[PDB]
Write a protein that holds these residues in place. Structure first.
Motif, PDB file in Angstrom:
ATOM      1  N   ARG C   5       0.819  -1.199   0.000  1.00  0.00           N
ATOM      2  CA  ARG C   5       0.000   0.000   0.000  1.00  0.00           C
ATOM      3  C   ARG C   5       0.850   1.245   0.000  1.00  0.00           C
ATOM      4  O   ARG C   5       1.851   1.371   0.721  1.00  0.00           O
ATOM      5  CB  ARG C   5      -1.076   0.008   1.104  1.00  0.00           C
ATOM      6  CG  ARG C   5      -0.706   0.504   2.467  1.00  0.00           C
ATOM      7  CD  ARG C   5      -1.958   0.746   3.344  1.00  0.00           C
ATOM      8  NE  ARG C   5      -1.615   1.504   4.562  1.00  0.00           N
ATOM      9  CZ  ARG C   5      -1.220   0.970   5.723  1.00  0.00           C
ATOM     10  NH1 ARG C   5      -1.118  -0.351   5.865  1.00  0.00           N
ATOM     11  NH2 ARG C   5      -0.913   1.762   6.757  1.00  0.00           N
ATOM     12  N   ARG C   6       0.433   2.168  -0.844  1.00  0.00           N
ATOM     13  CA  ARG C   6       1.106   3.422  -0.972  1.00  0.00           C
ATOM     14  C   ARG C   6       0.821   4.244   0.269  1.00  0.00           C
ATOM     15  O   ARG C   6      -0.328   4.382   0.678  1.00  0.00           O
ATOM     16  CB  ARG C   6       0.613   4.131  -2.214  1.00  0.00           C
ATOM     17  CG  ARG C   6       1.725   4.682  -3.004  1.00  0.00           C
ATOM     18  CD  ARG C   6       2.102   5.973  -2.488  1.00  0.00           C
ATOM     19  NE  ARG C   6       2.810   6.774  -3.470  1.00  0.00           N
ATOM     20  CZ  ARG C   6       2.287   7.220  -4.601  1.00  0.00           C
ATOM     21  NH1 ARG C   6       1.045   6.900  -4.940  1.00  0.00           N
ATOM     22  NH2 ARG C   6       3.020   7.984  -5.405  1.00  0.00           N
ATOM     23  N   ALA C  18       5.764  13.062 -10.619  1.00  0.00           N
ATOM     24  CA  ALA C  18       6.898  12.285 -10.129  1.00  0.00           C
ATOM     25  C   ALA C  18       6.835  10.855 -10.685  1.00  0.00           C
ATOM     26  O   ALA C  18       5.750  10.301 -10.850  1.00  0.00           O
ATOM     27  CB  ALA C  18       6.890  12.274  -8.606  1.00  0.00           C
ATOM     28  N   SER C  19       7.998  10.274 -10.977  1.00  0.00           N
ATOM     29  CA  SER C  19       8.099   8.857 -11.374  1.00  0.00           C
ATOM     30  C   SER C  19       8.662   7.978 -10.231  1.00  0.00           C
ATOM     31  O   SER C  19       9.400   7.010 -10.462  1.00  0.00           O
ATOM     32  CB  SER C  19       8.936   8.739 -12.644  1.00  0.00           C
ATOM     33  OG  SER C  19      10.202   9.348 -12.499  1.00  0.00           O
ATOM     34  N   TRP C  20       8.273   8.323  -9.005  1.00  0.00           N
ATOM     35  CA  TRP C  20       8.572   7.536  -7.818  1.00  0.00           C
ATOM     36  C   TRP C  20       7.472   7.748  -6.782  1.00  0.00           C
ATOM     37  O   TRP C  20       6.711   8.725  -6.855  1.00  0.00           O
ATOM     38  CB  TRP C  20       9.924   7.925  -7.244  1.00  0.00           C
ATOM     39  CG  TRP C  20       9.941   9.337  -6.720  1.00  0.00           C
ATOM     40  CD1 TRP C  20       9.667   9.748  -5.450  1.00  0.00           C
ATOM     41  CD2 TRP C  20      10.229  10.506  -7.474  1.00  0.00           C
ATOM     42  NE1 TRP C  20       9.773  11.118  -5.366  1.00  0.00           N
ATOM     43  CE2 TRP C  20      10.106  11.606  -6.603  1.00  0.00           C
ATOM     44  CE3 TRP C  20      10.573  10.732  -8.812  1.00  0.00           C
ATOM     45  CZ2 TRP C  20      10.325  12.920  -7.023  1.00  0.00           C
ATOM     46  CZ3 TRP C  20      10.781  12.029  -9.231  1.00  0.00           C
ATOM     47  CH2 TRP C  20      10.666  13.109  -8.336  1.00  0.00           C
ATOM     48  N   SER C  21       7.403   6.826  -5.828  1.00  0.00           N
ATOM     49  CA  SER C  21       6.538   6.935  -4.665  1.00  0.00           C
ATOM     50  C   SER C  21       7.392   7.278  -3.454  1.00  0.00           C
ATOM     51  O   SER C  21       8.445   6.657  -3.230  1.00  0.00           O
ATOM     52  CB  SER C  21       5.804   5.615  -4.406  1.00  0.00           C
ATOM     53  OG  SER C  21       4.914   5.299  -5.463  1.00  0.00           O
ATOM     54  N   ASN C  22       6.950   8.252  -2.666  1.00  0.00           N
ATOM     55  CA  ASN C  22       7.704   8.635  -1.459  1.00  0.00           C
ATOM     56  C   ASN C  22       7.823   7.473  -0.490  1.00  0.00           C
ATOM     57  O   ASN C  22       8.901   7.230   0.056  1.00  0.00           O
ATOM     58  CB  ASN C  22       7.075   9.863  -0.761  1.00  0.00           C
ATOM     59  CG  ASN C  22       7.399  11.167  -1.465  1.00  0.00           C
ATOM     60  OD1 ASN C  22       6.663  12.156  -1.348  1.00  0.00           O
ATOM     61  ND2 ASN C  22       8.493  11.185  -2.202  1.00  0.00           N
ATOM     62  N   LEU C  24       6.228   3.235   0.267  1.00  0.00           N
ATOM     63  CA  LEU C  24       5.413   2.060  -0.037  1.00  0.00           C
ATOM     64  C   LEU C  24       5.593   1.100   1.112  1.00  0.00           C
ATOM     65  O   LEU C  24       6.732   0.740   1.432  1.00  0.00           O
ATOM     66  CB  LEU C  24       5.870   1.363  -1.324  1.00  0.00           C
ATOM     67  CG  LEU C  24       5.841   2.136  -2.643  1.00  0.00           C
ATOM     68  CD1 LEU C  24       6.598   1.348  -3.679  1.00  0.00           C
ATOM     69  CD2 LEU C  24       4.421   2.391  -3.099  1.00  0.00           C
ATOM     70  N   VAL C  31       9.208   0.957   2.613  1.00  0.00           N
ATOM     71  CA  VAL C  31      10.161   1.301   1.578  1.00  0.00           C
ATOM     72  C   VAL C  31       9.975   2.776   1.289  1.00  0.00           C
ATOM     73  O   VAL C  31       8.859   3.221   1.018  1.00  0.00           O
ATOM     74  CB  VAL C  31       9.917   0.479   0.302  1.00  0.00           C
ATOM     75  CG1 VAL C  31      10.920   0.866  -0.791  1.00  0.00           C
ATOM     76  CG2 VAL C  31       9.944  -1.048   0.602  1.00  0.00           C
ATOM     77  N   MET C  32      11.064   3.527   1.339  1.00  0.00           N
ATOM     78  CA  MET C  32      11.009   4.962   1.216  1.00  0.00           C
ATOM     79  C   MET C  32      11.970   5.449   0.161  1.00  0.00           C
ATOM     80  O   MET C  32      13.077   4.922   0.026  1.00  0.00           O
ATOM     81  CB  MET C  32      11.391   5.620   2.567  1.00  0.00           C
ATOM     82  CG  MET C  32      10.372   5.404   3.696  1.00  0.00           C
ATOM     83  SD  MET C  32      10.875   6.046   5.348  1.00  0.00           S
ATOM     84  CE  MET C  32      11.600   4.530   6.002  1.00  0.00           C
ATOM     85  N   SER C  33      11.568   6.495  -0.546  1.00  0.00           N
ATOM     86  CA  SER C  33      12.468   7.222  -1.409  1.00  0.00           C
ATOM     87  C   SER C  33      13.468   8.007  -0.597  1.00  0.00           C
ATOM     88  O   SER C  33      13.253   8.306   0.580  1.00  0.00           O
ATOM     89  CB  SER C  33      11.683   8.194  -2.320  1.00  0.00           C
ATOM     90  OG  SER C  33      10.999   7.477  -3.351  1.00  0.00           O
ATOM     91  N   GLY C  34      14.555   8.385  -1.251  1.00  0.00           N
ATOM     92  CA  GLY C  34      15.541   9.247  -0.643  1.00  0.00           C
ATOM     93  C   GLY C  34      14.906  10.573  -0.289  1.00  0.00           C
ATOM     94  O   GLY C  34      14.145  11.147  -1.086  1.00  0.00           O
ATOM     95  N   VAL C 120      19.966  16.446  -6.259  1.00  0.00           N
ATOM     96  CA  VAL C 120      18.986  16.965  -7.202  1.00  0.00           C
ATOM     97  C   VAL C 120      18.668  18.457  -7.171  1.00  0.00           C
ATOM     98  O   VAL C 120      18.157  18.950  -8.152  1.00  0.00           O
ATOM     99  CB  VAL C 120      17.660  16.158  -7.202  1.00  0.00           C
ATOM    100  CG1 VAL C 120      17.906  14.712  -7.722  1.00  0.00           C
ATOM    101  CG2 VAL C 120      17.006  16.178  -5.850  1.00  0.00           C
TER     102      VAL C 120
END
Lengths: 142, 142, 143
Positions: C5-6, C18-22, C24, C31-34, C120
């Protein structure tokens, strides 16, 4: 004990000199080595038409797809992508490649993107370390 | 609900001021901090014989081995190595080191190797972030 | 089969470009983005009050905590922090941030900290890739 099976994509052999496995299925987890657009980048650049970051990212994500499918999985199994670029300005091109690659698919993997000082071959603009497991599908995310 | 245990290697005392743990056993996963050849590298440099990337890579992998063993594990539990180098030309030296370290062993862990701009001490040529699980053995890879 | 689940934290909108999920939640694994200190860093720099590495690392760790909380977790769930800095000299500033953020526990996550050549946004000094599980608490390790 959990079974480990080495996954082999025909286009990505683990050659005799190599001290790594391209893909190992560890239970449901598909553990993958970092993927690059080499040698397609080598050929393409030598012929005077180097792959830009966008093209390289697509080639890299294609390798990830090949490993996934060789293990019996699909793109929806991916939950995190670690992206290493040589030029941070190429971040938008990587995003565009990801929008195309995941065109499916309502939900993207997590990601971290950083500019590194160099990659294993000088033609390379990007390397992706991907994480996947065969028991999930982001395409149907709660 | 999952058990976590602090894993301390005798050879690698965790210093009380550090804001990281060298190793944590999280269920069957042995979670490790990045390992370096410091302070052996400082002594070597000071005595006029700095460790090359091959020597440093072996020191590093030796520390990973010490943590695994402290958890009751072994080198076969490793499934991924993230290698950060300060000079990409050292990639082959690191490979030589892995070939030796895994001389056992049929199947190598997955790997990503990139060149970073800097490591935590100036004498360092390499740092490895190692990933391992106590319920697998790559020596039994199918 | 493992449920995913997001996880949406209000302070950290996933923006539809965005092409990522912050974040999941994959089983018990968050699971987290940077995470980075942008856009706070842009506001701060414009103001003539650019955030230093310690301040940035704390903003970043606050974002990680926001994601954890959005998933029903807490900072004890963190078991690894990979830290990318633009200046290796800032390593001790990240240390200070961690001592403060983890003031409530004795056992810290595992870590790797390396200097990258770029992040970035130009105002950034640090990005952290955080790993957590909702079914652990590192404070239980304290001895």
């Amino acid at each position: 004990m959990t079974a480990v099976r080495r996954i082999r994509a025909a286009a990505l052999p683990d050659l005799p000199d190599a001290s790594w496995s391209n893909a190992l299925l560890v239970g449901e987890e598909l553990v993958m080595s970092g993927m690059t657009a080499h040698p397609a980048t080598r050929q393409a650049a030598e012929r005077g038409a180097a792959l830009d970051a966008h093209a390289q990212a697509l080639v890299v994500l294609g390798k990830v797809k090949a490993l996934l499918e060789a293990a019996g999985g699909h793109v929806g199994n991916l939950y995190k992508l670690n992206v290493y670029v040589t030029r941070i300005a190429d971040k938008d091109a990587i995003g565009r490649a990801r929008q195309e690659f995941f065109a499916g698919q309502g939900t993207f993997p997590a990601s971290t993107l950083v500019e590194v000082s160099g990659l294993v071959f000088p033609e390379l603009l990007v390397e992706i370390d991907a994480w996947a497991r065969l028991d999930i599908d982001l395409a149907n995310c709660d």
